[PDB]
Amino acid sequence: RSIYLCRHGESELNLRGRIGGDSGLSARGKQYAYALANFIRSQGISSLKVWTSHMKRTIQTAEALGVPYEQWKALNEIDAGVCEEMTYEEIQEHYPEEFALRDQDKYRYRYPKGESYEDLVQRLEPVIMELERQENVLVICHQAVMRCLLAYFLDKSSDELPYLKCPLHTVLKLTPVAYGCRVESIYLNV
Amino acid sequence: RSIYLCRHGESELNLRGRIGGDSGLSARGKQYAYALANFIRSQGISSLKVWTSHMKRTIQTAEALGVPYEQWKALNEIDAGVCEEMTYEEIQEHYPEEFALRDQDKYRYRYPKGESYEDLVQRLEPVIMELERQENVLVICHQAVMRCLLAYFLDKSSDELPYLKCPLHTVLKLTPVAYGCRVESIYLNV
């Protein structure tokens, strides 16, 4: 079996250089969702479980599949708390202290009223448990969530975790094996 | 003697989360240009020299001071090369390997056809020597440029350099003293 990890197609907020929030897909975000469906089809899979977060950007991208999907709250993006929907310039200006502190310990730092990667890793324990005892699964999630899941399957330290390559519109096909996990990166250009 | 370092009021690209470019001051970016003129006047500085880069956002902010200023090409922001005007999501998507190599060594790293902080420090050398043989100077510049000037006066290393705190709308008043340099950060809220 394989585990397909990718995140929702480009959102309005991604487009506007802002973090978090709960915005919908952009025009090409929607075009990614259709490209994702064609990719999943071209894989010749007979049974596939599709997981989504509760955020609209993931649900909408799953809608384009045509198949049923389950919504996990634990797959919701990291909460930047006070800094939700702000740009980095904005957070650097109004929260210079926080930003700097976040840069010194990215794995444990939480923005005021927010979550840390460490917290995210913790709430993702049951998602990983399930994944490990399932067959083909497609997880349409978020950059931070995807980084945590990928670190687990690729045995990465908590230091490497926050910097793991997790672009938009790229499907990571993971095939767990006896000890490691194979990885293949598919870029859906749209 | 005092050296005042600040960057142009918020640009149009700043508002969109895009790097580089040559956009102009945004509405509140102008409001900062004004508040800066108020701060500067109430500082009662004797024969204050005002340096600016060759870019719009910089000249535009100096324009609101009333007093004349000079432009140095050497003070132009770091060139992100092919990633110019891109959001971070965009560079992570279209240039995933490049984005990753950057986080590895931010001082020496160059985007495709862009400049590194090391390159920046080089072209700023003649700015530092002039700044040295001066009295009171207000240098209205850019984030990467400010980091390089600041690193010099505050005796910071090349590693700390790319991560030095340089918010928008904040003046950093440096006063070279015998043991080094005293610092005062003034946030101009607008």
UniProtKB/Swiss-Prot annotation, chains A, B:
Residues that hold ATP according to the record: F99, A100, L101, R102, Q143, A144, V145, M146, R147, Y179
Region (Fructose-2,6-bisphosphatase): 1-190
Site entry: Transition state stabilizer: H142
Active site (catalytic residues): H8 (tele-phosphohistidine intermediate), E77 (proton donor/acceptor)
Binding residue positions for beta-D-fructose 2,6-bisphosphate: R7, N14, G20, R57, Y88, R102, K106, Y117, Q143, R147
UniProt note on tissues of expression: Liver.
Subunit annotation: Homodimer.
Protein family per UniProt: In the C-terminal section; belongs to the phosphoglycerate mutase family.
Main function: Synthesis and degradation of fructose 2,6-bisphosphate.
Protein name (database record): 6-phosphofructo-2-kinase/fructose-2,6-bisphosphatase 1
Organism whose genome encodes this protein: Rattus norvegicus
